Enzyme design. Structure first.
Site, PDB file in Angstrom:
ATOM      1  N   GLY I  29       9.205  -4.749  -7.905  1.00  0.00           N
ATOM      2  CA  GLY I  29      10.293  -4.327  -6.414  1.00  0.00           C
ATOM      3  C   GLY I  29       9.609  -3.854  -6.085  1.00  0.00           C
ATOM      4  O   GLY I  29       8.417  -4.001  -5.990  1.00  0.00           O
ATOM      5  N   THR I  30      10.373  -3.326  -4.583  1.00  0.00           N
ATOM      6  CA  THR I  30       9.699  -2.575  -3.695  1.00  0.00           C
ATOM      7  C   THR I  30       9.289  -0.832  -3.962  1.00  0.00           C
ATOM      8  O   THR I  30       9.880  -0.782  -5.207  1.00  0.00           O
ATOM      9  CB  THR I  30      10.861  -1.983  -2.467  1.00  0.00           C
ATOM     10  N   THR I  31       8.825  -0.376  -3.316  1.00  0.00           N
ATOM     11  CA  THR I  31       8.013   0.609  -3.894  1.00  0.00           C
ATOM     12  C   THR I  31       9.119   1.796  -3.041  1.00  0.00           C
ATOM     13  O   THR I  31       9.597   1.892  -2.130  1.00  0.00           O
ATOM     14  CB  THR I  31       6.389   0.935  -2.284  1.00  0.00           C
ATOM     15  N   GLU I  46      11.250   2.046  -0.027  1.00  0.00           N
ATOM     16  CA  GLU I  46      10.737   1.082   1.225  1.00  0.00           C
ATOM     17  C   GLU I  46      11.848   0.090   0.941  1.00  0.00           C
ATOM     18  O   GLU I  46      11.817  -0.614  -0.598  1.00  0.00           O
ATOM     19  CB  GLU I  46       8.839   0.184   0.549  1.00  0.00           C
ATOM     20  N   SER I  74      13.265   1.016  -8.619  1.00  0.00           N
ATOM     21  CA  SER I  74      12.495  -0.375  -8.389  1.00  0.00           C
ATOM     22  C   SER I  74      12.787  -1.209  -8.891  1.00  0.00           C
ATOM     23  O   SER I  74      12.943  -0.676 -10.833  1.00  0.00           O
ATOM     24  CB  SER I  74      11.092  -0.197  -7.974  1.00  0.00           C
TER      25      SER I  74
END
Ligand SMILES: [Cl-]
Lengths: 195, 4, 116, 250, 231, 235, 244, 240, 243, 241
Positions: I29-31, I46, I74
């Site tokens: 996943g994204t930060t 993010e 995330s």
């Protein structure tokens, strides 16, 4: 109110049942048969609350007929009466009890004996030489106490029942529009036309 | 239910 | 009594009066007084000696002397007259049976013999 | 969630074996030795207190359990399975008998109830059988003294004397030679201690042996007086001292 | 491989294969385009026939007077999810006298799809949806994937060869967003967008399906000779 | 084993795709929609000559304005017909009118995907639902166990379907009379049937606005078979 | 999910057999032999206890022969625990029938009910069947003396003489040879013991390895007596018939 | 509750549990149904592997559902009892609400419905049973014979057989049963039914059961001697 | 083998592989980050701009619970939404009975027990999210991080997703260089920087910064999104620091 | 080989899922110790904060179940907290129903009975934790009762749990072999904690700072945990003799 009488003679059981169906001051019918054939040698007469009477009789008829088909055997009148009692005994403590009083007239082929059973809506059962439900009850009991004998013939039984109905027609204050009479013997269940 |  | 026996076996401990008292009051309260039981619960346990009363609606109270039933007012009269702090065993049996006698004689609901 | 295991985990194999019941019996075999002997005037049940650690207080762990005042139980196999069975056994003695008849059940009927609980774990959905064999000793007015074995299957048999677990085969042979129908209770305890010494490796004393009897009524253990018909429990667990006394006359 | 038996099983790389397989049903589905300005939001759907005797499967479903979607994948799943939106739009009206916000409609679809990806026995939804609507914050276009992921967009496309229409919209972004108070020109841009996803077949009268919702425009569907204007 | 509601890597439900195979093994059923009515025809396909063919009921009345032909595991259809009849009557009770043919079809198709671990598997039978309503006139629908339904000017399902559908592709026009449609169903059935087509192993039916849904007598169908043979011999 | 671990106890083999029923029957074939013999004037139930010990209390022991009511008894072959579950069900059904009709239950009706329960465990629920075969010895005033058997399949059949458990093949051959219709109880007792004596896997047949029961009109006048033989009584009938 | 889908589709579009149920039927003892002009006869095989049987009390292969309808079967006996009980209950339930006994077609449709339900219900396997349901509708003199199978399909038959070697006895009936002129009398119809079973049975002793159903609830089961007279006459005519 | 096919099955190691596989979905996943400041907490995430067609500032990822708790995650976004929905039910029932808003440690265990419950049965799948959450209660500021296993601890700083190692390094510097603590407005600026620095692990597609905060002084102990001038001030600071 | 996936018997009569649950117990790599004084029960546990970003105050494997009962867990924190919440619930329910504080050994039995169920019912997995319950019981006095995933429990004079339990066990065994008593003959709990820490140091061969340990103390009518500063005072005393 409805007359249902029963007399057990030597070799048969005779059931007289009033022909009138009434709601308040209205006569709905004058030729009503207040009886169901439970099995070929067992007859049940019934009197009580509208709907409940037929609904209960037809429900009992269906259960006894089912037993007959499943076992290819006829339940004894003692057995049928015990079943019927237990069904009524359940109903009193139910949400809406069946308000039905019944007479069960049967010929036991094993014992070669006629049997009469009186059961009230509470599930109170007794075997009697003669029985009755309703206002007619007390009168017919006093009359049959006098005239009844155990060794009476079917013809003698009919005459004594004829006398009861005659006497009830005078004494009772409601027109019950005559009775239907049915005999239960070894040969089965037949209706007496002349009465 | 009977009932001191 | 049954549930207290199972609890005693489960815990490996002699039962306590407060347990019987709690279990009785929660049962009687559940049935909103329709179970008409008016009990004086007493006993000794590892905690000490205890005396409680419990009403049918599930209210409990503590006391040094309690009375219940139709003869409670005859019994309480004797208890209120003769009770003192630091009673001996012989004095407590006497006072108890005297309070029952009061009930037996003066109450039509109470009669016959005294059980202690 | 929901228990979605509504199906049997114990089934018949082509050979007609019930695998999980056999495997449960294998678990019982690995278990510590326990035995029961029936005398004319009592019954004795005994087992070894196999302490997991010397820091552990072995007194706190009860292998011999009172079920009713007149019925005791001991096991071989999985201890946790035994503990929950004792809890269920004690409760069913009340719910299915005492709360109906106002008296404790006779030995054979309580055994019957325990057996039923163990049969159900053998057929019901999403459960394995209990990994224990029970020895249940008891007295009742009309049957007198009796000793029963109950297996993971739910099968139970009455015994004059028997043993279950580690050294059962050897123990049963020893009991067959020593048992007669004229044994007094003290004689049965002596034989029980002799039989159990053969299956124990380490220390053999009152602190490492758990032994109870079904014998005479113990009015001193009732906890109250004033009712002649209540004479107290026939189940008694022997103390550490009482065992050591009988090991000097061994 | 071994981890695609059911939806309750993660793969060693943290993938849900039953969800990815459901996502595949969409790519097999017929192309549908969504795009909006500030004033209006438009759905354009290429309907697919079984053969020349058969009708063209309906792609656009009305949810309320101010909201509806187009489908690509299992139609029966689109019926279940659209029926759920209809009820949630309806509940919002009856209880709160409030037209359901398009953003909240998305949140509700997402949460419904999710439950079917974490529980044993069930299966993921096998359909993608493009929800258009006009609410108190103006025109809205949403893309629903049966993974549960819902995304608010100016324009997009789903189904077979959808990438062609999506590239066109990505170029036209600055043009079609400015088409305010002109419904016909916004539909023209939608029809020109879906045209980038066609091969062999072209847009016919019983092939093309268009829907529009806007400032003073209830959600209405155009089929048959009603779309002949835009061919 | 594996889930009953499981998706294949191609994004299709295994159990639905497998049921579609069961339908291919079924006896042929053909439907042709005209402006004068909708004709429904079936291959009876008796397994033995001792089987009384008239007892084979593969064409079924749902209401006065909706008929139904089946192909596949025909036993599975009994509960679908039961639901359709109930839906049709129930709607008439609630709204004092005939239910739209599309609404009735949609109601049947809502049962399709009610299977999981509801019923244990999809239906193994396809239905041709033919009818008339005031709004959309004479209509023919194909109801699959997928829960999808298509409207068709003409449609064939069962063993001889792809062969029959290619024939219906050429033969169907918008100006077909009912008499023409009847002959056309008999013609295509006779083509794809194993045994020789007669009045006993094949059954015709139609739905008109006037007379509603009627299953043709064997005597009536016999005459249309004789009329077909003569017109094919005429060139 | 949980599907992974489901044995599926209620499915057909490609040959159209029920796996679990067939394997349950295999189980029963290893159980101690039980024999029923029906005579004109009564019924005999004989059954062999499985390899006993000298330290088993026999007089208070019951694994084979159980009482259902005053008129009906069963011999068990299979899991004793499974049998007891069904026996208590049968005992309740008998008392339900008596409560309802004020008549003792006909033998076949009780047999059919127990057999209907076994059938259920083979068609639904996903549980293992009961690993039990019964020999029902009963009397009613319709058919008189009756012998039935039920097996895990829930199928039941009537018999003049029948065996269940171990060596039924051998046992059924010996019964079929020496049984006659005009046979009496005393003769039927002798046949039952002679059959077990020849089919037994044990070295010799002794009193401590047998359970024995008779249902006789040998009760003062027009009534029926159940006799579950005591150890000493089995020892006496073994000497009388001349096996020990 | 146990929900597991036991009856599912296979890649070739077959339901194996339903097909394996038909295999159970194939294993079952042969049952034949022949309808005459004014009667229907139900013949049934009794495998003679079982002697020392008590024929008085042993469950008979032909069951009465009502006074005017009979059901014979091939396959698992235990399974057949559950269908017979359900049918018998429905028969009394119909009389109670419609004030008329079931038609043979209605009783067949009900039993067939039950068999079908057990092919797409969770946790249950199909019935390993095919039935022949025969009788006369109330106040009707037209003979009725229907067949059902585990799948739940049902159909009417001039004559039909089910169970082991049914292929052989169906072959016999297909050449020996004329539709234009069916067995005129009871004699002719019973004879043809006994003849058809003699192709498969082995011995004509206690291996053949015959039940004759006539109009107006007239049902009788023939005895050993009555059947033995048919067996004697058939083979004496064959010796030529 | 086969110990990794079913959830709630212990491997011979004593591990639940299905939970370890869920962690892979999280790592994918994204930060997302959390910073605990003097009198509150800051959350940042993010948001990858897949296409120009994505409407800026519309696809909001950070979620509020009650009025005082912020949640960011995330991994599988839907799984995150499902967990927050439960969080809102737990926070509602607590306030209904006890009147006071749910304390953060109390709220942390409510999520913890729920997530742990999805590791007890093979009939459910573990959560495919690591959840960073916290806010202000009566006892002050609290930041928490919750893993698919149901494991959670209190944190000075927290980070999860593809850029977690990069973020964790930048958080470890702030803790060392600010022992006396960090202000709410400072933490917003630093949060921006750490997301921009952590974006080097997702450098292919350009992104959109989203920040929220609960501060006793700056938001009155309520969860608010950073918007307009203050958001642009944080972006400018972040852009200046990478250059 | 599905007999290794769920809690059914293997042919050897073993439950592999229970055995593998025991292995999960050491996943944290933490060692716990429990001893009894005259008037007190002391439990010490290693505290490891590997991440600088962690708030060290929130990292704990000791739980206050009731006012009287304390619980230290050896195993992963999710299962630990699952067990903690259940024990807290059970202790509260007991007080309400039976009108007295749940004894240490009765809670131990209850949690052990729950553990047993997970070993017999297939749909439930065992918890990968060993629960050590400590109190000063009003009947039995200083009490240590320990539960494991098998559903086993027993009382202890002292006990140790974790990777290096055998080293700590023998160290304690050897002390009690000398003193020939079932407890630490010490008046103050402060000195009983000093004993506990000292004998762990000697057994593991590691020195401890204030942040390396986690201490729980049970006295009559309360169980409490020591702060970092309370432990620092304890460590200073040890060093000064
Ligand atoms: Cl418990």
């Amino acid at each position: 109110m409805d007359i249902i009488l029963g007399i057990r003679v030597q070799d048969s059981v005779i059931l007289a049942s009033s022909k009138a169906v009434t709601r308040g001051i209205s006569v709905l019918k004058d030729s009503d048969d207040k009886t169901r054939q439970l099995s070929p040698h067992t007859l049940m007469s019934f009197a009580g609350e509208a709907g409940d009477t037929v609904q209960f009789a037809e429900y009992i008829q269906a259960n006894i007929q089912l037993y007959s088909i499943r076992e290819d055997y006829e339940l004894s009148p003692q057995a049928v009466s015990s079943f019927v009692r237990q069904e009524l005994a359940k109903s009193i403590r139910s949400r809406r009890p069946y308000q039905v009083n019944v007479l069960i007239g049967g010929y036991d082929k094993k014992k070669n004996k006629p049997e009469l059973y009186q059961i009230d809506y509470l599930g109170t059962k007794v075997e009697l030489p003669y029985g009755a439900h309703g206002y007619s009850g007390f009168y017919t009991f006093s009359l049959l106490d006098h005239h009844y004998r155990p060794d009476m013939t079917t013809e003698e039984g009919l005459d004594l029942l004829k006398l009861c109905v005659q006497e009830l027609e005078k004494r009772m204050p409601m027109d019950f529009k005559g009775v239907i009479v049915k005999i239960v013997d070894k040969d089965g269940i037949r209706q007496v036309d002349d009465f | 239910x009977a009932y001191x | 009594g049954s549930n207290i026996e199972l609890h005693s076996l489960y815990t490996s401990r002699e039962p306590r009066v407060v347990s019987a008292l709690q279990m009785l009051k929660q049962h009687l309260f559940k049935y909103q007084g329709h179970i008409g039981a008016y009990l004086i619960v007493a006993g000794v346990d590892p905690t000490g000696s205890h005396l409680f009363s419990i009403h049918a609606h599930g209210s409990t109270d503590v006391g040094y002397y309690l009375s219940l039933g139709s003869g409670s007012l005859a019994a309480m009269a004797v208890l209120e007259s003769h009770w003192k702090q630091d009673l001996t065993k012989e004095e407590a049996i006497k006072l108890a049976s005297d309070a029952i006698q009061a009930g037996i004689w003066n109450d039509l609901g109470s009669g016959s013999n005294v059980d202690v | 969630m929901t228990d979605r295991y509504s199906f049997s985990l114990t089934t018949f194999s082509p050979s007609g074996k019930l695998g999980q019941i056999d495997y449960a019996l294998t678990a019982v075999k690995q278990g510590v030795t326990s035995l029961g002997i029936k005398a004319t005037n009592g019954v004795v049940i005994a087992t070894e207190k196999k302490s997991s650690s010397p820091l552990a207080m072995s007194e706190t762990l009860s292998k011999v359990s009172l079920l009713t005042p007149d019925i005791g139980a001991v096991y071989s196999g999985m201890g946790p399975d035994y503990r929950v069975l004792v809890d269920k056994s004690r409760k069913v003695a009340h719910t299915s008998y005492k709360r109906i008849y106002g008296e404790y059940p006779p030995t054979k009927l309580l055994v019957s109830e325990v057996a039923k609980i163990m049969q159900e774990a053998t057929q019901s959905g999403g459960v394995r059988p209990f990994g224990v064999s029970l020895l249940i000793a008891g007295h009742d007015e009309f049957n007198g003294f009796s000793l029963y074995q109950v297996d993971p299957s739910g099968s139970y048999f009455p015994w004059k004397a028997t043993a279950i677990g580690k050294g059962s085969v050897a123990a049963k042979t020893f009991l067959e030679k020593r048992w007669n129908d004229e044994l007094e209770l003290e004689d049965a305890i002596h034989i029980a201690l002799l039989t159990l010494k053969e299956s124990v490796e380490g220390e053999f004393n009152g602190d490492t042996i758990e032994l109870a009897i079904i014998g005479d009524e113990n009015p001193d253990l009732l906890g109250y007086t004033g009712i002649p018909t209540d004479k107290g429990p026939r189940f008694r667990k022997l103390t550490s001292q009482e065992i050591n006394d009988r090991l000097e006359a061994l | 491989n071994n981890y695609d038996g059911d939806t309750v099983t993660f793969s060693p790389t943290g993938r849900l294969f039953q969800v990815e397989y459901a996502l595949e049903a969409i790519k097999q589905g017929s192309v549908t385009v969504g795009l909006r300005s500030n004033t209006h939001a438009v759905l354009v759907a290429l309907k697919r026939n079984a053969d020349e005797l058969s009708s063209y499967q309906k792609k656009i479903i009305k949810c309320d007077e101010h909201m509806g979607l187009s489908l690509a994948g299992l139609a029966p799943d689109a019926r279940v999810l659209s029926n759920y939106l209809r009820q949630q739009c309806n509940y919002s009206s009856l209880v709160f006298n409030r037209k359901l916000a398009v953003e909240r409609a998305g949140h509700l679809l997402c949460d419904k799809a999710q439950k079917n990806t974490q529980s044993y026995g069930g299966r993921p939804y096998g359909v993608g949806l493009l929800i258009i609507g006009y609410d108190k914050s103006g025109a809205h276009l949403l893309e629903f994937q049966p993974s549960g992921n819902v995304t608010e967009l100016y324009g997009t496309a789903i189904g077979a060869r959808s990438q062609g229409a999506k590239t066109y919209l990505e170029r036209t972004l600055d043009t079609f967003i400015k088409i305010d108070g002109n419904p016909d020109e916004l539909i023209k841009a939608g029809v020109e967008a879906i045209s980038q996803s066609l091969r062999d077949e072209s847009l016919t009268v019983d092939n093309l399906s268009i829907a529009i919702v806007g400032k003073d425009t209830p959600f209405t569907i155009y089929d048959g000779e009603a779309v002949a204007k835009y061919i | 084993d594996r889930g009953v509601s499981t998706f294949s890597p191609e994004g299709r439900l295994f159990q639905v795709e497998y049921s579609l195979e069961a339908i291919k093994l079924g006896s042929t059923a053909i439907g042709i929609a005209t402006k004068e009515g909708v004709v429904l025809g079936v291959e009876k396909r008796a397994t033995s000559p001792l089987l009384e063919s008239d007892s084979i009921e593969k064409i079924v009345e749902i209401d006065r304005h909706i008929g139904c032909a089946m192909s596949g595991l025909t036993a599975d259809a009994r509960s679908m017909i039961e639901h359709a009849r109930t839906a049709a009557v129930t709607h008439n009770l609630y709204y004092d009118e005939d239910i739209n043919v599309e609404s009735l079809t949609q109601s049947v198709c809502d049962l399709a995907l009610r299977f999981g671990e509801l019923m244990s598997r999809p239906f193994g039978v396809a239905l041709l639902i033919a009818g008339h309503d005031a709004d959309d006139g004479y209509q023919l629908f194909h109801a699959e166990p997928s829960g999808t339904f298509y409207r068709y000017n003409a449609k064939a399902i069962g063993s001889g379907s792809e062969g029959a559908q290619a024939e219906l592709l050429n033969e169907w026009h918008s100006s077909l009379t009912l008499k023409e449609a009847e002959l056309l169903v008999l013609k295509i059935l006779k083509q794809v049937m194993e045994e020789k087509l007669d009045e006993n192993n094949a059954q015709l039916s139609c739905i008109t606005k006037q007379d509603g849904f009627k299953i043709y007598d064997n005597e009536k169908t016999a005459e249309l078979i004789k009329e077909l043979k003569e017109k094919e011999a005429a060139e | 999910g949980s599907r992974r671990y489901d044995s599926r106890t209620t499915i057909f083999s490609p040959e159209g057999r029920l796996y679990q029923v067939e394997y349950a029957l295999e189980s029963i074939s290893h159980a101690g032999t039980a024999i029923g013999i029906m005579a004109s004037d009564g019924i005999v139930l004989a059954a062999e206890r499985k390899v006993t010990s000298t330290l088993l209390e026999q007089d208070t022991s019951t694994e084979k022969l159980y009482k259902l009511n005053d008129k009906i008894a069963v011999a068990v072959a299979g899991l004793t625990a499974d049998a007891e579950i069904l026996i208590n069900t049968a005992r309740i059904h008998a008392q339900n029938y008596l409560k309802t009709y004020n008549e003792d239950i006909p033998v076949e009706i009780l047999v059919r009910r127990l057999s209907d329960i076994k059938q259920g465990y083979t068609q639904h629920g996903g549980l293992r069947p009961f690993g039990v075969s019964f020999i029902y010895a009963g009397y009613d005033d319709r058919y008189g003396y009756q012998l039935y058997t039920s097996n895990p399949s829930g199928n039941y059949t009537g018999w003049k003489a029948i065996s269940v458990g171990a060596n039924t093949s051998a046992a059924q051959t010996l019964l079929q040879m020496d049984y006659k219709d005009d046979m009496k109880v005393d003769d039927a007792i002798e046949l039952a013991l002679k059959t077990l004596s020849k089919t037994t896997d044990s070295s010799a047949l002794t009193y401590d390895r047998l359970e024995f029961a008779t249902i006789r009109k040998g009760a003062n006048d027009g009534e029926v007596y159940q006799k579950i033989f005591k150890p000493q009584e089995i020892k006496d009938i073994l000497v009388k018939t001349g096996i020990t | 509750g146990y929900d597991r889908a036991l009856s599912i589709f296979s890649p070739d579009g077959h339901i194996f549990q339903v097909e394996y149920a038909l295999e159970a039927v194939k294993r079952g003892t042969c049952a034949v149904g022949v309808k005459g002009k004014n009667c229907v006869v139900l013949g049934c095989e009794r495998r003679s592997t079982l002697k020392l049987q008590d024929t008085r009390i042993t469950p008979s292969k032909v069951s009465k559902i009502d006074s005017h309808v009979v059901l014979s079967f091939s396959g698992l006996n235990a399974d057949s009892r559950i269908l017979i009980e359900k049918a018998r209950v429905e028969a009394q339930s119909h009389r109670l609400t419609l004030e008329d006994p079931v038609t043979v077609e209605y009783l067949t449709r009900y039993v067939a419905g039950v068999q079908q339900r057990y092919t797409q219900s969770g946790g249950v396997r199909p019935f390993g049973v095919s039935t022949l349901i025969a009788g006369f509708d109330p106040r009707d003199d037209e003979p009725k014979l229907y067949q059902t199978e585990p799948s739940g399909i049902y159909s009417s038959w001039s004559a039909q057989t089910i169970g082991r070697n049914s292929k052989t006895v169906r072959e016999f009936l297909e050449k020996n049963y004329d539709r234009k002129e069916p067995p005129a009398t009871v004699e002719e119809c019973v004879k043809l039914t006994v003849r058809s079973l003699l192709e498969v049975v082995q011995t004509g002793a206690k291996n053949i059961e015959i039940t004759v159903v006539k109009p107006d609830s007239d049902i009788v089961a023939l005895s050993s001697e009555e059947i033995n007279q048919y067996v004697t006459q058939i083979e004496q005519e064959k010796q030529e | 083998t086969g110990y990794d096919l079913s959830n709630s099955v212990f491997s011979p190691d004593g591990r639940n592989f299905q939970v370890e596989y869920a962690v892979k979905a999280v790592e994918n996943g994204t930060t997302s980050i959390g910073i605990k400041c003097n009198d509150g907490v800051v959350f940042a995430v993010e948001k990858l701009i897949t296409s120009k067609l994505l409407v800026p500032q519309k696809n909001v990822k950070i979620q509020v619970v009650d009025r005082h708790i912020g949640c960011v995650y995330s991994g599988l976004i839907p799984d995150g939404r499902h967990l927050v929905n439960r969080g809102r039910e737990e926070a509602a029932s607590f306030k209904k009975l006890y009147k006071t808003p749910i304390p953060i440690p109390a709220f942390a265990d409510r999520l913890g027990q729920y997530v742990q419950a999805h590791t007890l049965y093979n009939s459910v799948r573990p959560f495919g999210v690591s959840t960073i959450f916290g806010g202000v209660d009566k006892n002050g500021a609290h930041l928490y991080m919750l893993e698919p296993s149901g494991s959670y601890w209190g944190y000075k700083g927290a980070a999860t997703g593809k850029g977690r190692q990069s973020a964790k390094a930048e958080l470890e510097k702030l803790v060392d260089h600010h022992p006396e603590g960090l202000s709410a407005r400072e933490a917003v600026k630093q949060a921006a920087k750490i997301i921009y620095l952590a974006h080097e692990d997702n450098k292919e597609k350009d992104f959109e910064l989203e920040i929220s905060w609960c501060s006793l002084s700056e938001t009155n102990g309520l969860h608010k999104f950073v918007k307009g001038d203050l958001l642009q001030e944080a972006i400018d600071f972040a852009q200046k620091e990478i250059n | 080989g599905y007999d290794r996936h769920i809690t059914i018997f293997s042919p050897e009569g073993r439950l592999y899922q229970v055995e593998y649950a025991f292995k999960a117990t050491n996943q944290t790599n933490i060692n716990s110790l429990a001893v009894r004084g005259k008037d007190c029960t002391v439990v010490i546990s290693q505290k490891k904060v590997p991440d600088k970003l962690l708030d060290p105050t929130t990292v704990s494997y000791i739980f206050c179940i009731s006012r009287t009962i304390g619980m230290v867990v050896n195993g992963p924190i999710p299962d630990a907290r699952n067990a903690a919440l259940r024990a807290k619930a059970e202790a509260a329910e007991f007080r309400y129903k039976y009108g007295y504080d749940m004894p240490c050994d009765v809670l131990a039995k209850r949690m052990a009975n729950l553990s047993q169920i997970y070993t017999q019912r297939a749909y439930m997995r065992p918890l990968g934790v060993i629960l050590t319950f400590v109190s000063v019981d009003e009947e039995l006095g200083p009490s240590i009762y320990k539960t494991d995933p098998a559903g086993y429990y027993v009382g202890y004079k002292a006990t140790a749990t974790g990777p290096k339990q055998q080293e700590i066990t023998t160290n304690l065994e050897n002390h009690f072999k000398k003193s020939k008593i079932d407890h630490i003959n010490e008046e103050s709990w402060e000195k009983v904690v000093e004993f506990a820490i000292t004998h762990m140091i000697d057994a593991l061969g590691t020195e401890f700072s204030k942040n390396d340990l986690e201490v729980g103390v049970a006295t009559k009518d309360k169980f409490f945990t020591l702060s970092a500063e309370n432990i620092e005072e304890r460590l200073v005393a040890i060093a000064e003799q």
